[PDB]
UniProtKB/Swiss-Prot annotation:
Protein name: Group 1 truncated hemoglobin LI637
Species for this entry: Chlamydomonas moewusii
Predominant cellular place of this UniProt entry's protein: plastid
Entry keywords, A to Z: Chloroplast, Heme, Iron, Metal-binding, Oxygen transport, Plastid, Transit peptide, Transport
Boundaries of the shown chain within the full protein: 44 to 164 of 164
GO molecular function terms attached to this record: heme binding; metal ion binding; oxygen binding; oxygen carrier activity
């Protein structure tokens, strides 16, 4: 599984932690999290990614569209690209092989339509 190739639990915990340190230091997206407990957020993101990367059987939290559709200003590709960039940079900083980063980013890309609450075509 991509989850295992990445290093499993320890690796994903490390990635999520570094990821959110970048998120809160980036004015392009940090205000969205001003009323969020970032330890709880780290917990939920790990659980979602474990599922999305093939390390967990299911995800029982909010579906991605419900989770973001009501955030304001409405999310755009500027925000999506900012978050994707932070996750990619985190994996690079953690020494993940570029080919594994590519696979992880494809998983992230697959969430775009729902995360951005866009017409499903
Ligand atoms: C890159 C793709 C993204 C993924 C996979 C993702 C995933 C998630 C997940 C799993 C949750 C938790 C949902 C729950 O409560 O069950 C969440 C919450 C949230 N996300 Fe994202 N997200 C993404 C992008 C973004 C972007 C671009 C923003 C805006 C800058 C954003 C803002 C938020 C906020 C504000 C919350 C909830 C905060 C709270 O409940 O306190 N997310 N996201
Ligand atoms: C997204 N947190």
């Amino acid at each position: 599984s991509l989850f295992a190739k990445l290093g499993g639990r320890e690796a994903v915990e490390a990635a999520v932690d570094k990821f959110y340190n970048k998120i809160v230091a980036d004015p392009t997206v940090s205000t969205y999290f001003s009323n969020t407990d970032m330890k709880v957020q780290r917990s939920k993101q790990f659980a979602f990614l474990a599922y999305a990367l093939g390390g967990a059987s299911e995800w029982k939290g909010k579906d991605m569209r419900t989770a973001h559709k009501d955030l304001v200003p409405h999310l755009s590709d500027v925000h999506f690209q900012a978050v994707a960039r932070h996750l990619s940079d985190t994996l690079t900083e953690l020494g993940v092989p570029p080919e594994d980063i590519t696979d992880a980013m494809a998983v992230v890309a697959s969430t775009r339509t729902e995360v951005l609450n866009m017409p499903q075509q």
